[PDB]
Amino acid sequence: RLSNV
Amino acid sequence: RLSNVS
Amino acid sequence: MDKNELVQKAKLAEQAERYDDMAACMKSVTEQGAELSNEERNLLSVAYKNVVGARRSSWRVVSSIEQKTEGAEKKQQMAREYREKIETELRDICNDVLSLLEKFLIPNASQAESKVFYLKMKGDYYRYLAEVAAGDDKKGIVDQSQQAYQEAFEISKKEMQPTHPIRLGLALNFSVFYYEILNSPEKACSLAKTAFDEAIAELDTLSEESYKDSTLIMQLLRDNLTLWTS
Amino acid sequence: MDKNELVQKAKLAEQAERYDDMAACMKSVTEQGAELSNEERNLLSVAYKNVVGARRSSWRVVSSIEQKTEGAEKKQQMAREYREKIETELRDICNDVLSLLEKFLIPNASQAESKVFYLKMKGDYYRYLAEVAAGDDKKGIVDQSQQAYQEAFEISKKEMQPTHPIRLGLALNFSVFYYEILNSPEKACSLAKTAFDEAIAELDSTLIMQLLRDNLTLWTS
């Protein structure tokens, strides 16, 4: 997982 | 400046 | 106490890396009843990304120590209690944002773009709640996340180019939810792939305004598409 | 409630990067009135380092903005009040520490090592308070900083090895106080050179010695 930052 | 740790 | 002053503080606070303050400012702006501008909207969402992000990361660490002290039962009890404290913070914060969404931000959204943005935010803070939810309460919260994600997805499909960074970020976060919350790696990966492929195929539409952010998100998409089907 | 319980909280908090929590735990351990272990004392000092360091950093930022908006008067006023907010927290935190030092840490210090460490802390947090003090209040507070540093300096000359990191640490800050607060680059340099001079003898620590050198190049260049 890698979600918006 | 520059004092001790972190 | 007037709107422009709040927005000024919030940026000051953003400069000072003091996000509780940035949050509180944008909260008050929101509570004044009028639809946020694009700047205000982005300040608010940046403010709470950081406020919420700190706790979720603190939870990751303390949770991880809880797992790793099985057999050291007093140590573990200690970590469990501290995790509970963090979880209480997570809850006030989520319930603040979800309450702003329900009372002001979603009712006041007149353009489709801002409805998607806010419906996706809701999916997010519902996602965060669900990560620290117990039992039957959890099941309910998970549906709530899915519903707000899904509704955002349908408006984005209708009203926004595939290269729009709000639409792309929605796709990322939805695919993440499918994977991390509903344990569907297939559903997660297909949604990720479609989002990314459709952005590529309509690269013509990527504006210079949107370029930096869309690309960042597309990276995150393809990165996640890798380590899901490794 | 319990001391072992609070020490573990503090470590957990540190792992979590939640230093308000870390500090409060170690506050409660101090307020139990017994002399802190070395472990506990480093917990305390790390905790408030971070708590205080975040405001010093924020203050710097908003203060830069207050300056750079001269002419834009309403904007400057906004920055100025916000700086004032930060200064209130900075004062709460300094008074907290200084109070723990008056009531608990300095009275209970049974060894030279720790009395010096804590008198330096006092120098430090008086320095911090001073940096956001007004008028005559500033002057008296700068003095209290001088005194705590001096006393620690005198005890360290007499009771500690010149290579000891608490003793070199004292010399760094004390010399930095001479530069930054009292504008004495001659007193700053002398002090820092003398500590480096006396440590180098009994090497037969490096980081602090390096830091002394670093600061020395800045002041004269």
If phi > 0 it is left, if psi is from -120 to 50 it is alpha, else beta; for residue C33 that is: left
Contact D49 B5 (CB under 8 A): yes
Do the two domains C1-108 and C110-230 of this chain adopt the same fold? yes
D110-221 CATH fold? Delta-Endotoxin; domain 1 (1.20.190)
CATH fold of C1-108: Delta-Endotoxin; domain 1 (1.20.190)
Euclidean distance between CA atoms C47 and C27, whole angstroms: 10
Distance from C-alpha of D2 to C-alpha of C18, rounded to nearest angstrom: 32
Which of C172, C183, C213 to mutate against chain A (most A CBs within 10 Å)?
Answer: C172
Name the CATH superfamily for C110-230: 14-3-3 domain (1.20.190.20)
DSSP C71: T
Would you call C65 an interface residue with chain D, using a CB distance cutoff of 8 Å? yes
CA–CA gap between residue C201 and residue C175 (Å, rounded): 20
CB-based contact, D16 to chain C, within 8 Å: yes
Q: Which residue in D78, D84, D82 sits closest to C4, CA to CA?
A: D78
What are the residue ranges spanned by the domains of chain C? 1-108, 110-230
Are B6 and D49 spatial neighbours (Cβ–Cβ below 8 Å)?
yes
Question: C-alpha angle D142/D145/D151, rounded to 5°?
Answer: 140
Cα C211 from Cα C216, distance rounded (Å): 9
Q: Which two tokens stand for residue C1?
A: 């106490």
Neighbours of chain A (3+ CB pairs under 8 A): C
The encoded tokens of residue D116 equal: 């010096």
Look at residue D107 and give its three-state secondary structure.
helix
Query: d(Cα D10, Cα D8) in Å, to the nearest integer?
Result: 5
Chain D residues with beta carbon closer than 8 angstroms to that of B1: 176, 180, 215, 218
Q: Cβ D172–B4 below 8 Å, yes or no?
A: yes
CA distances from C55 to C61, C82, C137 (A): 10, 12, 21
Planar angle of CA D106, D109, D110, nearest 5 degrees: 155
d(CA D108, CA C20): 37
List the Cα angle D138/D85/C28 in 5-degree steps.
170
Distance from CA of D1 to the nearest CA of B (A): 30
Could D215 and B1 be called an inter-chain contact, meaning their C-beta atoms sit closer than 8 Å?
A: yes
- What is the b/e burial string over C79-102, where b = at least 16 CB atoms within 10 angstroms of the residue's CB? beebbebbbebbeebbebbbebbe
